[PDB]
Amino acid sequence: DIIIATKNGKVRGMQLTVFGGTVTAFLGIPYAQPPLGRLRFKKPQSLTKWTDIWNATKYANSCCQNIDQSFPGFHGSEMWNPNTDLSEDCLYLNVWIPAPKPKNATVLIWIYGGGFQTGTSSLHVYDGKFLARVERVIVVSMNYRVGALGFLALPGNPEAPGNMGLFDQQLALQWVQKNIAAFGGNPKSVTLFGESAGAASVSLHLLSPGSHSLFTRAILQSGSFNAPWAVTSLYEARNRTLNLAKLTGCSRENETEIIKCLRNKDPQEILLNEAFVVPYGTPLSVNFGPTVDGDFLTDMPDILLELGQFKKTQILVGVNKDEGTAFLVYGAPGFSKDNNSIITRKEFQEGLKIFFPGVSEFGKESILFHYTDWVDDQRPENYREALGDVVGDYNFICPALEFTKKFSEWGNNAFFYYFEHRSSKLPWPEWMGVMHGYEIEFVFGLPLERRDQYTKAEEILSRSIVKRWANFAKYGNPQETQNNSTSWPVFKSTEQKYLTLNTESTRIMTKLRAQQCRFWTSFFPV
Amino acid sequence: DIIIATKNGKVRGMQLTVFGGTVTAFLGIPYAQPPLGRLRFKKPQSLTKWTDIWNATKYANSCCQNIDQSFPGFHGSEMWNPNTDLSEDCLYLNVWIPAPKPKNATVLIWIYGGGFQTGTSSLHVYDGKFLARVERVIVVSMNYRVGALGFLALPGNPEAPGNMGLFDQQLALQWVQKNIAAFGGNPKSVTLFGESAGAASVSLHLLSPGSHSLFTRAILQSGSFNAPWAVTSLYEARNRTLNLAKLTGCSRENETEIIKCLRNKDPQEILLNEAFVVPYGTPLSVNFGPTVDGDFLTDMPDILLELGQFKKTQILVGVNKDEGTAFLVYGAPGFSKDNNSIITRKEFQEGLKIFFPGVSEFGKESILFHYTDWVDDQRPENYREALGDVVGDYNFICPALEFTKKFSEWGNNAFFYYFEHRSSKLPWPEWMGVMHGYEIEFVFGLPLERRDQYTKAEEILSRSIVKRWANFAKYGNPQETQNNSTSWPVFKSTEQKYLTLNTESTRIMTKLRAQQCRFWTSFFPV
Amino acid sequence: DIIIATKNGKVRGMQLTVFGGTVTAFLGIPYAQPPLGRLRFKKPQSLTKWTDIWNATKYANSCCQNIDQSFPGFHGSEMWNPNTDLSEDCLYLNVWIPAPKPKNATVLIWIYGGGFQTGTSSLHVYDGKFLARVERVIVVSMNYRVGALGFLALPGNPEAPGNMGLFDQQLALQWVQKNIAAFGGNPKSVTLFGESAGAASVSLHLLSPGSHSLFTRAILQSGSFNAPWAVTSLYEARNRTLNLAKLTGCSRENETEIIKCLRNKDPQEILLNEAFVVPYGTPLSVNFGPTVDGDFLTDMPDILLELGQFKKTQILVGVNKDEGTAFLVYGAPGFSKDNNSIITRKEFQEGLKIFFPGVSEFGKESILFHYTDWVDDQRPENYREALGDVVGDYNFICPALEFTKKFSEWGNNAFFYYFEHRSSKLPWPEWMGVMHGYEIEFVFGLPLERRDQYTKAEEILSRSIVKRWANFAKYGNPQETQNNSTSWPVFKSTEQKYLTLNTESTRIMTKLRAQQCRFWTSFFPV
Ligand SMILES: *[C@@H]1O[C@H](CO[C@H]2O[C@@H](C)[C@@H](O)[C@@H](O)[C@@H]2O)[C@@H](O[C@@H]2O[C@H](CO)[C@@H](O)[C@H](O)[C@H]2NC(C)=O)[C@H](O)[C@H]1NC(C)=O
Ligand SMILES: *[C@@H]1O[C@H](CO[C@H]2O[C@@H](C)[C@@H](O)[C@@H](O)[C@@H]2O)[C@@H](O[C@@H]2O[C@H](CO)[C@@H](O)[C@H](O)[C@H]2NC(C)=O)[C@H](O)[C@H]1NC(C)=O
Ligand SMILES: *[C@@H]1O[C@H](CO[C@H]2O[C@@H](C)[C@@H](O)[C@@H](O)[C@@H]2O)[C@@H](O[C@@H]2O[C@H](CO)[C@@H](O)[C@H](O)[C@H]2NC(C)=O)[C@H](O)[C@H]1NC(C)=O
Ligand SMILES: *[C@@H]1O[C@H](CO[C@H]2O[C@@H](C)[C@@H](O)[C@@H](O)[C@@H]2O)[C@@H](O[C@@H]2O[C@H](CO)[C@@H](O)[C@H](O)[C@H]2NC(C)=O)[C@H](O)[C@H]1NC(C)=O
Ligand SMILES: *[C@@H]1O[C@H](CO[C@H]2O[C@@H](C)[C@@H](O)[C@@H](O)[C@@H]2O)[C@@H](O[C@@H]2O[C@H](CO)[C@@H](O)[C@H](O)[C@H]2NC(C)=O)[C@H](O)[C@H]1NC(C)=O
Ligand SMILES: *[C@@H]1O[C@H](CO[C@H]2O[C@@H](C)[C@@H](O)[C@@H](O)[C@@H]2O)[C@@H](O[C@@H]2O[C@H](CO)[C@@H](O)[C@H](O)[C@H]2NC(C)=O)[C@H](O)[C@H]1NC(C)=O
Ligand SMILES: *[C@@H]1O[C@H](CO[C@H]2O[C@@H](C)[C@@H](O)[C@@H](O)[C@@H]2O)[C@@H](O)[C@H](O)[C@H]1NC(C)=O
Ligand SMILES: *[C@@H]1O[C@H](CO[C@H]2O[C@@H](C)[C@@H](O)[C@@H](O)[C@@H]2O)[C@@H](O)[C@H](O)[C@H]1NC(C)=O
Ligand SMILES: *[C@@H]1O[C@H](CO[C@H]2O[C@@H](C)[C@@H](O)[C@@H](O)[C@@H]2O)[C@@H](O)[C@H](O)[C@H]1NC(C)=O
Ligand SMILES: *[C@@H]1O[C@H](CO)[C@@H](O)[C@H](O)[C@H]1NC(C)=O
Ligand SMILES: *[C@@H]1O[C@H](CO)[C@@H](O)[C@H](O)[C@H]1NC(C)=O
Ligand SMILES: *[C@@H]1O[C@H](CO)[C@@H](O)[C@H](O)[C@H]1NC(C)=O
Ligand SMILES: *[C@@H]1O[C@H](CO)[C@@H](O)[C@H](O)[C@H]1NC(C)=O
Ligand SMILES: *[C@@H]1O[C@H](CO)[C@@H](O)[C@H](O)[C@H]1NC(C)=O
Ligand SMILES: *[C@@H]1O[C@H](CO)[C@@H](O)[C@H](O)[C@H]1NC(C)=O
Ligand SMILES: *[C@@H]1O[C@H](CO)[C@@H](O)[C@H](O)[C@H]1NC(C)=O
Ligand SMILES: *[C@@H]1O[C@H](CO)[C@@H](O)[C@H](O)[C@H]1NC(C)=O
Ligand SMILES: *[C@@H]1O[C@H](CO)[C@@H](O)[C@H](O)[C@H]1NC(C)=O
Ligand SMILES: [Cl-]
Ligand SMILES: [Cl-]
Ligand SMILES: [Cl-]
Ligand SMILES: [Cl-]
Ligand SMILES: [Cl-]
Ligand SMILES: [Cl-]
Ligand SMILES: [Cl-]
Ligand SMILES: [Cl-]
Ligand SMILES: [Cl-]
Ligand SMILES: [Cl-]
Ligand SMILES: [Cl-]
Ligand SMILES: [Cl-]
Ligand code: NA
């Protein structure tokens, strides 16, 4: 029986057998006051003693959020949907620790993605018992509020100041600072890791003065705050808060009255109107996201990055080979998970409209000009491939490269990976390739479990990735030093070296997407 | 209703609408005991609690000072004259803060120019509500004593020790250290900025051990302590204190009796005799200025600069294209604001006498030799242009370049600008060009106010300058990172790169006034 | 009336008119318990409150010491003899401060030479009122014990542990740390300066862990611990302590009994037998000097220097053109202050015997071979010049160069001077040239006093040297920045640049005495 005394009370955990060993999991520990009633849309408030043995033996509620009902019954999409009840009372975190209890273990804190509109820490692909077992690190993960409830912003107004879900993540990081030594953890060796919006969140904790001392290093998988979906302008946020108000009959003349009104709405009426706060959306819409609130984020983060105002530490950054494909089946014409999606030039052009709402005509021709000079015009999957690359390069890959470039110019070691392995079990079709989100199960070690029907080459790839992530967290260097592995070079402006992750053998290459990102990065920002 | 609790009591401010937003202004907060009676000519004494809600709702009195009556009725000159009552009771400061109240805002502290003989913080061109509104910085500005009342020196004698007006500025900087967090300010991010004598003052706070920890960075507009008007020798100061005494029938044998006598004179008798403490003056005379007092200034500041004894931090330094023209209408023969001032060779020579009192004949021929080799002797405005350049290069431009050169040799980033835009509203005539003092309204944002009849190109120039000054203060780097702007390089001995500020497009150039300043800087110091 | 409160009591000083200004001198303040009776040969003991206004209005007693009676009546020698009564009660120091009292003045602490056998701080050439007046520094100087009474060593035995006179200097440096702020001094800006044995002492305070935090920078005039006269081996010290014992009928079997016996002898019987503790001496004999005592000096100081174990700071080091001449009239055959001393080859060889006691015959031939290859054999002053250079290069110049070389290799700025001006008033004859000891009056400013019959070129030279020493102390850089002076380069291994000090104009040169010092430094150590 395992009871740990925390600053706020005792917690009981549960033992887990993993790979003939034991991990202790403390699932669903609370880290803030439930943000209900009068606390809705406010910054999370600190938690007071229970006393009391809190039983942390199951995952807690996930935060309220719309769910993906596009493919009912389909594992590829439904695997991302919440797997605990939804509730505004969702501010909990999970701790997994090796057994026997470590002495001063390095801590890995996971921040989930989901567009800032969705996600939960209890997903199966985020289960941190493999990492704790195999690498003897402690893994922590937290639920933070998403959608309007986590990011609604009425700028400067503490009733809805914005970034609440980023302040939830932050209060979780404090909880680790204050409490993790009790579980056997080293609060001085804490690495944040996150994917997509979770990565973008990691990148903003790098810029946030209040997070500076809550962690040591950072890992960004498929995301960074400079991605075009990751920060809402003050203009847009205002328009959106008011549009939500209007749609819920909460329009007022006094803004504090708007918020008061919205605090009376049911979680569901808020969720139902989120999608419409915007005249046209895309499959990549982030209606309620991070904003420059003067608190968490003191200035437009592009200025902070350019001028070197951020936590000085090592970063590990990466992307997958086919980032953009996943999104094309949520609204691009001619695209289906259920056929090979060979689309036409005219369809490609219609797709640009779906993904680039407006976007001058000249803007959209320019994408077309850049991506459709074939070599050569023979290949029927030409336009289908091009639309996926457009969406991935713009939304994920070039913004990750440009973040890494700018961060490293201030003197810190940065490591960049290009993940190019398609899981043998991917439920999505072949044409979608190495999709967004599908490195995650490799990082968390799921392929280490033989009972699971991954290939042997995949077990070995995962084992290597886990070692590299763990050495990065413990030592700031993502090497696998024992098995004559390719040495991972730092990424510098100038050479821009990166490491490819695949089952055959990993290469050092240079200047990923050079020609493409010159387009997105220099020209497109029409 | 906005009340802030300060170390010395409460203060009430007032709300201001600026650009559809709100700024809170706390005008006329006191920062020292009024320096009256027995405190006249003494260092400022700290302030004791009122208690009490101090109403900071209007600008305070300006310090006693002679006024410019050369052009009664004329906006070009009268705009610099005080606009609140004169009084020895003038030790107040102003705070402008964004609304809503910032969390930890960068602070900009303005130090006015006026030759150390005049000036006030309440002038319209020093109004810091635009900066606070637009950049969300806090702006502070203080009145400090000027003329004999601020700088009379009887060396080593604490009844008149010298530099009192520099100690007023310093006590204001402490007040910001102790109190600005209460208004939402970061005392660890404080930038001083000042023009002309205000800049010279900024440059001496860089050398003053007692100011070292009262600020972070420095901006010097048109001035630096090494300018020939900015520091009085001990010889001159003594002669001048005694001359003043003599002129007010205060001559004594005992020096403390001189001061005691002068403490009985009326503000006005002191002001009236200031101009005469010197056998011949120029339009650039600084009769009572900074001195090496062994307290504020521990050694001749040229030695401190050469040998690297100064606060190690970034500086932003600049000058205007026609610095010297403004002065020529206050006594050079043939010059008038009311015609094109085409003067003759013989007039030019008479002008050198006005500006270089004595100055050997050889000294003055040498200026003439250096500035009157025309290319070619055709042009009638030849001599008129030459006299203005003589006066600007000697008094402002070369001393600013040489300061920047010497400061940067010790390893700090320095940025240098050359301001070359003539305001569309300048009341002075065309031949006077881009005058001394007329970048100020651009730095403070006045052209951002459309209701004001500046051109569109001027709004844009001002907006850019404000961003560059603000990024310098917040991040030590005066870049405008968002609008594909010219990147501002650091100034190094060796290349001496500088940025030109004008409405068309800004250039990077090198070695401003190279041939001229070699003359003033190496040879002239005849 | 000027009274200063010190940690140990009050002290009254006296006002002095210097150059139409005022200096306050506190002459003869005590800094330790008188080391009498049972404290003889022991480390100095700290001082307890008097209370009490101590009157510091005259120089105190000088420490017991033999006196130079070679030239009774002659100013050249007698100027170095003590000018206050001799007494074991001699542990006092002097403070000179500018008036008005400075705020946080740099402190210069003088340590006198005299071979560790003689000297006193009250000499006229060490009077620090000119420095205090002219440069507004505070000057401190202390008497420390010399001869057997200051340096007798019975190794490891606290009754006579050795280096007592170096511990007197050290306790004086503490007194400045604890007390000088009260006089207006900055204990964080303290420079030690010393000549000959006083310089050697400065160089050992650089190596002494207990002095590390008692000062900032160091000046070494004509001396450094690696000079062949400056450190006594443990062998020699033992032999000498026992020889003294024997000569005073104090031989015992128990060593503590030897010391007890010697503590009963009269100052005079000790002084009288000092000269004989050694079978043969030279005019440069240092019978009782610094030793490696395991306390002040933890290891042979040559090892500490080579291996970089010393205070890391700037040093200023120098020598005079004719160091060795002064000594030749105290025993070399054919030499006289009263004729031109043209000696013969055979006389030169006899001189080597006087100066190199033993010294194999081969050792002495080798000096002769190195110094007597004339260019050419014509010149009658050939051998007279050669003997002086031998004595100066060996004893002073090469050891100063080698110290500077080795100190600078660890990364600190070092400045080296070669002083080549013969005082217009030197009482010694012309052939003796620029003698040892005769830069001192220039460093202390005596030529600044016109009433004194130095030439105008000498006033100017002294004024420059004073400025350079003062800037070194205040700023770590011995420049004279105002009068277009030659810039003094740092001394590096590799170039070995040095500055010449003379009345005409100073040069930068390289590799002083290169060929000579290769001999003394590499080969001679036969
Ligand atoms: C700010 O909002 C308006 C859209 O107004 C919205 O009303 C909301 C309650 C919501 O239902 C939303 O769907 C609706 O559009 C944006 O301007 C809109 O542009 C289109 C173009 O035809 C119009 O049809 C909309 O009605 C029009 N607004 C209206 C009704 O006046 C506007 O673009 C947006 N600003 C942004 C994009 O930041
Ligand atoms: C691949 O399928 C897409 C997706 O749309 C279809 O899904 C199919 C599996 C099928 O069940 C079909 O009924 C369903 O609508 C096809 O795109 C569609 O093309 C059809 C053919 O006319 C159009 O009618 C639809 O408008 C269009 N769907 C939309 C709204 O995007 C696509 O043609 C098919 N392409 C292949 C096989 O290459
Ligand atoms: C120090 O002052 C004297 C000037 O004496 C002055 O008396 C004052 C009260 C004031 O009224 C002032 O105008 C008057 O000059 C300077 O020397 C002066 O040089 C001129 C040359 O002819 C004489 O006419 C002045 O009278 C003469 N002084 C006198 C009257 O003895 C002197 O230059 C100045 N020192 C400086 C410049 O530092
Ligand atoms: C430009 O004007 C100057 C300034 O002096 C004059 O101001 C004018 C606008 C006018 O009202 C005139 O009365 C006033 O004195 C002129 O300099 C002057 O030149 C005049 C002509 O003789 C002389 O008499 C004055 O001594 C001299 N003024 C002084 C004391 O500086 C100047 O000539 C004129 N030049 C032009 C038009 O190019
Ligand atoms: C250690 O001392 C002896 C010298 O013994 C000395 O007795 C002393 C009291 C003193 O009077 C001193 O003058 C006398 O020499 C040194 O050895 C000496 O070498 C010479 C060579 O002929 C002899 O004449 C000395 O007497 C002889 N010592 C004796 C008497 O035994 C010895 O060199 C010295 N060790 C050193 C130099 O460290
Ligand atoms: C320079 O003088 C030296 C020093 O010795 C002498 O001092 C002289 C001023 C004179 O009074 C003389 O009496 C005194 O002894 C001379 O050296 C001496 O040379 C003499 C000449 O025979 C010898 O007898 C001495 O032994 C020797 N003195 C010693 C002991 O050193 C020297 O000769 C003289 N040389 C010149 C003038 O060039
Ligand atoms: C735990 O280690 C603490 C220092 O941690 C450092 O070492 C590594 C873990 C590295 O990743 C860095 O994060 C850290 O700088 C030490 O101060 C504590 O005392 C230790 N606590 C224990 C063992 O109880
Ligand atoms: C306010 O920030 C403090 C540190 O300020 C630094 O960050 C920038 C503002 C920069 O310009 C530098 O001037 C500073 O080094 C921090 O110590 C305080 O805790 C903060 N105070 C708050 C938020 O209350
Ligand atoms: C006196 O100055 C102190 C710091 O002294 C530094 O500055 C120069 C004097 C330099 O030579 C260095 O020696 C020192 O690092 C400061 O800490 C004290 O507060 C000052 N004391 C006063 C003015 O009372
Ligand atoms: C808490 O849960 C544990 C684990 O299932 C159980 O054994 C324990 O009795 C529970 N305690 C209570 C009563 O909350
Ligand atoms: C807005 O209404 C809220 C309701 O409590 C009130 O607190 C606030 O003062 C009001 N402000 C105004 C006048 O708009
Ligand atoms: C190294 O390879 C071995 C087998 O040769 C494998 O079992 C092990 O897991 C590998 N270690 C890592 C961290 O990849
Ligand atoms: C101070 O001035 C304010 C603003 O005008 C006013 O409302 C307030 O009543 C004043 N308080 C007093 C009586 O000083
Ligand atoms: C000068 O006069 C003042 C008047 O108070 C006095 O304090 C001071 O001691 C006097 N000094 C002298 C003697 O000059
Ligand atoms: C950038 O340019 C835009 C318009 O393209 C302008 O409105 C904005 O004020 C500029 N920003 C700065 C800081 O110059
Ligand atoms: C100390 O000496 C001073 C200066 O000569 C003298 O004025 C004072 O009275 C003395 N005090 C005593 C009695 O020691
Ligand atoms: C030496 O004699 C001293 C005299 O006090 C004594 O203290 C010490 O113990 C003696 N040691 C011996 C036995 O040599
Ligand atoms: C500089 O030279 C001047 C005269 O030109 C002289 O009076 C002054 O003492 C010099 N300063 C120094 C420090 O040498
Ligand atoms: Cl799965
Ligand atoms: Cl087309
Ligand atoms: Cl093809
Ligand atoms: Cl590529
Ligand atoms: Cl105006
Ligand atoms: Cl002429
Ligand atoms: Cl021409
Ligand atoms: Cl130019
Ligand atoms: Cl003398
Ligand atoms: Cl021979
Ligand atoms: Cl010859
Ligand atoms: Cl030489
Ligand atoms: Na040899």
mmCIF file with all atom_site columns, C-alpha atoms and ligand atoms in Angstrom, chain B residues 333-336 338-342, ligand 4:
data_model
loop_
_atom_site.group_PDB
_atom_site.id
_atom_site.type_symbol
_atom_site.label_atom_id
_atom_site.label_alt_id
_atom_site.label_comp_id
_atom_site.label_asym_id
_atom_site.label_entity_id
_atom_site.label_seq_id
_atom_site.pdbx_PDB_ins_code
_atom_site.Cartn_x
_atom_site.Cartn_y
_atom_site.Cartn_z
_atom_site.occupancy
_atom_site.B_iso_or_equiv
_atom_site.pdbx_formal_charge
_atom_site.auth_seq_id
_atom_site.auth_comp_id
_atom_site.auth_asym_id
_atom_site.auth_atom_id
_atom_site.pdbx_PDB_model_num
ATOM   1  C CA  . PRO B 1 333 ? 25.085 88.480 -37.586 1.00 0.00 ? 333 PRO B CA  1
ATOM   2  C CA  . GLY B 1 334 ? 22.987 88.335 -40.770 1.00 0.00 ? 334 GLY B CA  1
ATOM   3  C CA  . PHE B 1 335 ? 20.828 85.472 -39.493 1.00 0.00 ? 335 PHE B CA  1
ATOM   4  C CA  . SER B 1 336 ? 17.030 85.661 -39.215 1.00 0.00 ? 336 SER B CA  1
ATOM   5  C CA  . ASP B 1 338 ? 12.337 85.769 -41.095 1.00 0.00 ? 338 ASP B CA  1
ATOM   6  C CA  . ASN B 1 339 ? 14.497 85.562 -44.292 1.00 0.00 ? 339 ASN B CA  1
ATOM   7  C CA  . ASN B 1 340 ? 16.832 83.059 -45.890 1.00 0.00 ? 340 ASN B CA  1
ATOM   8  C CA  . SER B 1 341 ? 19.871 84.357 -44.009 1.00 0.00 ? 341 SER B CA  1
ATOM   9  C CA  . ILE B 1 342 ? 22.281 84.265 -46.963 1.00 0.00 ? 342 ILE B CA  1
HETATM 10 C C1  . LIG D 2 .   ? 17.700 88.982 -42.929 1.00 0.00 ? 4   LIG D C1  1
HETATM 11 O O1  . LIG D 2 .   ? 17.339 89.653 -41.752 1.00 0.00 ? 4   LIG D O1  1
HETATM 12 C C2  . LIG D 2 .   ? 18.436 89.957 -40.941 1.00 0.00 ? 4   LIG D C2  1
HETATM 13 C C3  . LIG D 2 .   ? 17.989 90.248 -39.507 1.00 0.00 ? 4   LIG D C3  1
HETATM 14 O O2  . LIG D 2 .   ? 17.885 91.611 -39.137 1.00 0.00 ? 4   LIG D O2  1
HETATM 15 C C4  . LIG D 2 .   ? 16.647 92.115 -39.658 1.00 0.00 ? 4   LIG D C4  1
HETATM 16 O O3  . LIG D 2 .   ? 15.485 91.319 -39.590 1.00 0.00 ? 4   LIG D O3  1
HETATM 17 C C5  . LIG D 2 .   ? 14.812 91.586 -40.812 1.00 0.00 ? 4   LIG D C5  1
HETATM 18 C C6  . LIG D 2 .   ? 13.668 90.587 -41.036 1.00 0.00 ? 4   LIG D C6  1
HETATM 19 C C7  . LIG D 2 .   ? 14.453 93.098 -40.896 1.00 0.00 ? 4   LIG D C7  1
HETATM 20 O O4  . LIG D 2 .   ? 13.258 93.371 -40.179 1.00 0.00 ? 4   LIG D O4  1
HETATM 21 C C8  . LIG D 2 .   ? 15.563 94.029 -40.367 1.00 0.00 ? 4   LIG D C8  1
HETATM 22 O O5  . LIG D 2 .   ? 15.018 95.287 -40.076 1.00 0.00 ? 4   LIG D O5  1
HETATM 23 C C9  . LIG D 2 .   ? 16.170 93.435 -39.099 1.00 0.00 ? 4   LIG D C9  1
HETATM 24 O O6  . LIG D 2 .   ? 17.217 94.182 -38.522 1.00 0.00 ? 4   LIG D O6  1
HETATM 25 C C10 . LIG D 2 .   ? 19.187 91.072 -41.616 1.00 0.00 ? 4   LIG D C10 1
HETATM 26 O O7  . LIG D 2 .   ? 20.351 91.284 -40.891 1.00 0.00 ? 4   LIG D O7  1
HETATM 27 C C11 . LIG D 2 .   ? 20.439 92.696 -40.768 1.00 0.00 ? 4   LIG D C11 1
HETATM 28 O O8  . LIG D 2 .   ? 20.784 93.284 -41.995 1.00 0.00 ? 4   LIG D O8  1
HETATM 29 C C12 . LIG D 2 .   ? 20.351 94.617 -41.871 1.00 0.00 ? 4   LIG D C12 1
HETATM 30 C C13 . LIG D 2 .   ? 20.364 95.304 -43.224 1.00 0.00 ? 4   LIG D C13 1
HETATM 31 O O9  . LIG D 2 .   ? 21.164 96.450 -43.023 1.00 0.00 ? 4   LIG D O9  1
HETATM 32 C C14 . LIG D 2 .   ? 21.294 95.334 -40.888 1.00 0.00 ? 4   LIG D C14 1
HETATM 33 O O10 . LIG D 2 .   ? 20.937 96.700 -40.796 1.00 0.00 ? 4   LIG D O10 1
HETATM 34 C C15 . LIG D 2 .   ? 21.316 94.660 -39.508 1.00 0.00 ? 4   LIG D C15 1
HETATM 35 O O11 . LIG D 2 .   ? 22.447 95.080 -38.780 1.00 0.00 ? 4   LIG D O11 1
HETATM 36 C C16 . LIG D 2 .   ? 21.324 93.141 -39.613 1.00 0.00 ? 4   LIG D C16 1
HETATM 37 N N1  . LIG D 2 .   ? 20.753 92.595 -38.400 1.00 0.00 ? 4   LIG D N1  1
HETATM 38 C C17 . LIG D 2 .   ? 21.453 92.081 -37.383 1.00 0.00 ? 4   LIG D C17 1
HETATM 39 C C18 . LIG D 2 .   ? 21.687 92.999 -36.206 1.00 0.00 ? 4   LIG D C18 1
HETATM 40 O O12 . LIG D 2 .   ? 21.877 90.920 -37.381 1.00 0.00 ? 4   LIG D O12 1
HETATM 41 C C19 . LIG D 2 .   ? 19.647 90.549 -42.954 1.00 0.00 ? 4   LIG D C19 1
HETATM 42 O O13 . LIG D 2 .   ? 20.300 91.564 -43.678 1.00 0.00 ? 4   LIG D O13 1
HETATM 43 C C20 . LIG D 2 .   ? 18.513 89.965 -43.763 1.00 0.00 ? 4   LIG D C20 1
HETATM 44 N N2  . LIG D 2 .   ? 19.188 89.354 -44.860 1.00 0.00 ? 4   LIG D N2  1
HETATM 45 C C21 . LIG D 2 .   ? 18.619 88.890 -45.969 1.00 0.00 ? 4   LIG D C21 1
HETATM 46 C C22 . LIG D 2 .   ? 17.264 89.415 -46.324 1.00 0.00 ? 4   LIG D C22 1
HETATM 47 O O14 . LIG D 2 .   ? 19.187 88.042 -46.682 1.00 0.00 ? 4   LIG D O14 1
#
